[PDB]
Design a protein around this ligand. Structure first.
Ligand code: ZN
Ligand code: ZN
Ligand code: ZN
Length: 134
């Protein structure tokens, strides 16, 4: 369809991530496709990994999405946080592209694996401190 789609490589990576060994997935839009921007393995607990994983990957003038893995599992696997980043300094065109495509990222990943959803426009919003206030 007309909307931005996840590449088959990104979908495959999603499945790999849910098997384990992935703490963070950064999804970005490149050439009208959703693709893998970055990924990181777990180091310690989900709370210990959080800020050092999330904060450095947030650009002051580009939106992105992060899938951040908790240590808990529900009955359909690891639980994830779905973090939407959209700083005001982003070009309006990018803000709307990312806003328009958010639901697609969640749908492709599988909403049933997502424990919670957060949004930020300043890094503090999506920091561990932000998550604890949510
Ligand atoms: Zn299409
Ligand atoms: Zn749960
Ligand atoms: Zn929530």
């Amino acid at each position: 369809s007309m909307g931005i789609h996840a590449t088959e490589e990104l979908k495959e990576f999603f499945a790999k991530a849910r098997a384990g060994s992935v703490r963070l997935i950064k999804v970005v839009i490149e050439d009208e496709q959703l693709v893998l921007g970055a990924s990181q393995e777990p180091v310690g607990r989900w709370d210990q990994d959080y800020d050092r994983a999330v904060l450095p990957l947030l650009d002051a003038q580009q939106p992105c999405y992060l899938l951040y893995r908790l240590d808990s599992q529900n009955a359909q696997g690891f639980e994830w946080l779905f973090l939407a980043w959209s700083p005001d300094n982003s070009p309006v065109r990018l803000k709307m592209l990312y806003a328009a495509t958010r639901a697609t990222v969640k749908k492709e990943f599988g909403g049933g694996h997502i424990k919670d959803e957060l949004f930020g426009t300043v890094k503090d919003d999506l920091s561990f401190a932000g998550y604890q206030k949510h």
